[model samples]
Target: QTSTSSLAKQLFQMTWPMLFGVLSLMSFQLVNSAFIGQLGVLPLAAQGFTMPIQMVIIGIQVGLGIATTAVISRAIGAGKTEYAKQLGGLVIVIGGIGVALIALVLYLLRQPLLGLLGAPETVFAIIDHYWLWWLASAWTGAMLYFYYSVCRANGNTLLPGTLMMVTSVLNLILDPIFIFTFDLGIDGAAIATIIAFGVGIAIVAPKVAQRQWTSYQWQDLNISQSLTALGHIMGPAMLSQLLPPLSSMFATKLLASFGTAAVAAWALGSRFEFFALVAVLAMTMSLPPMIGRMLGAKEITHIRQLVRIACQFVLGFQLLIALVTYVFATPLAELMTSETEVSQILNLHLVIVPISLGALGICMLMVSVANALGKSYVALTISALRLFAFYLPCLWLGAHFYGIEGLFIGALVGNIIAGWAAWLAYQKALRSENLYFQ
Candidate 1:
């Protein structure tokens, strides 16, 4: 049996690589935006409008990845190595077909979708040029995501993490060359992304084949059973993943009433918020496979112990992050914005909202844990409650009473309450006799 200290060390080892991967992915977007923004506002706005659609695609990929990891990891832990390999191959085939079909539909309906987002007529030319390449990029990225999930399921994060960093770095290098040197403009960004993903796949394919992780006899495959297993987790997990962006739309609409400064500050603050939670996000990715393995091995007590250690670390670590954010609030605000009013509001946000990030991290961790244990419906419910039941209402009430500052306080309170609810739900799951075991 692994000691608690060793488990903590293992968790740290698994998480740090993922942490760098997450940072690289996030930075890729930031750098991409910076490059795109230089071309002019219309192109930048066109790119901005595509974010929701991109998020939808990402949500689909993430759902599939989560399902793949959970099912395959459990199978491996249960000593069904051949079955796991079969499922790995099955997921890639199905996932590729599924994303291709979706991409085709999205491409065909691109005009209407753009119209729905109120894309101005002037940017239509830019988007039309950019759309198909973006879809291709998404398809390649989805395939890479599935492959990473396969690696992750087999307790190999380092390879996937390394590949992610490599892809991001490649994309960054190619972005300027394609965008400026070739005079491809915004479409160049998508082309660069496609090439980067293609390179990553080429590099990793041989490694995966050599390991035989995706090797299995054709006769042993059961498509129906594999689909059913994946479906159970994928459905709810997709919805859970989709919730945050939807909630953000509402929050943005509410903040819009306060004026452009409020919205701008929020935009800046939200980006920093994501950056600050990078480690927590990494933990969510790394922890699930471990949980799935433990579940398959029927180590119920160990599962709880592992989760407890994870939570403790998240809470303490995030609190320290909060302290750092608070200490650096002034400089961070000044650095992020030049407008005095925007800077002041952002400073206020930095001071207030980060204090509760630990709680929010816990809520996120619990949702991930629930999915890992195959209680996806429970995970979905927790996400819905955190967003709709607690977060939105608190934001409304807080803004109603205390104005913008109240909005920040509402965020803090909502997270704390959601964290508490998540903990209770997790305890109940542990107590339930029907807890999942493969």
Candidate 2:
């Protein structure tokens, strides 16, 4: 390990497309905020509450892709292409049912969901207006992402990423027109998102149905093919990813006691955190299956080099992003809200973010570790520790002790621990193979 220069030398390999793809995605969400911002606090905060709900959903949906693609890559490597074809119907059946159920539940329990999240009355009402109009589109949005994942699982990442980028841009462009020019407010934002999601789906769904990218056929993917080894892997793998949102949903209950402004501030604050400093995450996530697939195929030499490269590039590049974010922290915080007091707390959060982002970048690497090592349950434990064990308690205790400062500090502490924990876990998995250095 010492003799080699490490993956830092090839950081440029993943840089270009990653920049365009990530920025485009962030701008997509920014559109919702920009237009919603014009409608007054109620509308803006409504979008914030609903937005995280979508994030958690997106994470859960994407986790399905991890197992699917890892499975497909093995299919391709082993010349068992027919096995991969079965995923398409599973994608539709699983995703379609999931979205349909969510829409029905959200529609019926909209108020309770918001109330449980600790939303104040004013914010709750605004969220209701948005949810009433937006829930349908969330249905479509989830479907669109499911299709995107299908494309990704089939080795067609660029097409889906391109479609997502375009739809995201469309959301940004359309949101203002609907919200301000047409005077729709939260309803308009929801409708715009739904409409954009539908368009994005139209762009990709045909590619999937036609089987244009891979050698798979529509006939190959049947209802019966839905339950397979990969399908079984997805359940635990996804829940491991899904549980944090469940935790956040719990965290939201606690924050409700803090007041509308505080809750709303959190809704707004995480937006800035997500957008401004997401570089490392954008990079490291690209590694898991691409590397895991190789390892799964017993391409150990390639795997070693890939693991070395991925970890180094993720850590090194994130440090650079941290420096950049540190210099321009205030302007980024100003993106979501302009209120001085909120901005001040946010500005403090901005300072906290880079340190977190840097550690988080390493956290990204640690997360990939278990998956790459073929110990997905370890990935689950790594996932749980950061949120349930560390971040969640720290969130409450941090808020209890130092108030807002405690909250931010808690994140920094958890990331430091979780990041290190992830690395140690990574090494533990590798030790049996005589791959651990320390």
Candidate 3:
């Protein structure tokens, strides 16, 4: 058994690889957006219209990945190696088919969907150039995420992390060539993404095969049982993942009343916020499998210790990040925008909101921990509460009373309170007599 100190070290080591992987992936998106932004406002707006849809796709993929990790890792911990392998194979087949069908539906309904988003006719024309390729990339990307989850489930983040880096780098390299060199415009970005995912799939396929993690004999597998296990987690997990975007949309709508400058500042601040939470995001991916395995082994006490240590570390680390962002707020704000109002708003946002992100990170980590512990409903509840009950309400009240700066302060207060509540929810769920421990 690993000591508590050693477990902390182990968690940190596991996390850094994923941290780098997440950073690379974020960089790819930033650079991709930069390239698209250069094509002028129409193309960028077209891409923006696609983001909510993309988030839905990502939410589905991430839910499947979480379910895969939880199910397979627990099985492995319980010494049900054969069962884990069956699940490994089953998830890919099931998830691939499911995602493919969804992609097909989305593709078929693309026009209506874009129209519903209020995409203008001209912007819709730009979307038409790349929508199909984007769907294809989303499909391929789902498969790659499943494979990464499978590897992580087996306690090997190294391969998945490395592959993520390679894929991101590959996408980066291809983006310029396809977007500029070939003059394919936004379509080139989608095509480049598809190719990158395809290459990642090719590289990881053999590794999965060599390990014999996937079983071929579908007839011998317990399809019903596996589906039940996955579905138990997947449904709520997907909903949990989807809530953030919905809340963000609402927040944006609220901010829009303030003017274009406020919206632009919020947009830029959100970009920085995404990078700020990258470490938390990385931990959400990396820590779950460890927790799942520990649950399977019935290491409840260790699980508690692990959670505490992780929460503490995230809080401190993100506080440091907040300090740094505060110190560099002006320079960073200037670097991102020259518009005086936008820069000032973003600067104020950096000073007020980021300090609360550590708490937000804690809330997020608790949600993941709940899912890993087979408390999917608990996880969903915490997410709903965090967004609707705490964050959004505070946001509304702040805007009503104090305007923009009040809005930022409201966000800060909401996160801190939500973090406390999330921790409490986790504790209650952990102590439940009927905790799921299969």
List, residue by residue over 396-417, the lDDT tens digit for candidate 2: 8988888777877887787777
Each model's lDDT comes to 0.90, 0.66, 0.90
Task: Residues 391-426, candidate 3: write the lDDT tens digits.
Answer: 999999999999999999999999999999998998
Stretches of model 3 off by over 4 angstroms after superposition: 434-438
- lDDT, candidate 1, 1-438, per-residue tens: 467887898888888889899999999999999999999999899898888889999999999999999999999888888998888888888889999999899878878988888888887787777888999999999999899999889888888888889999999999999999998989999999999999999988788878888975769677788899999999999999889987678889889889999999999998898998998999999999998987888877778888999999989999998999999999999999899999999999999999888999999999999999989988999999999999999999988889899999999999999999999998897777555533
Clashes of each: 0, 0, 0
Between candidates 1 and 2, the one scoring higher on TM-score is 1
| TM-scores of the models, in the order given | 0.98, 0.80, 0.97
What TM-score does structure 1 among the candidates reach? 0.98
Candidate 1 structure lDDT: 0.90
Highest TM-score, which number?
1
C-alpha RMSD (angstroms) for model 1: 1.3
Model 3: how far residue 318 lies from native, Å:
0.9
Worst 10 residues of 3 by lDDT: 429-438
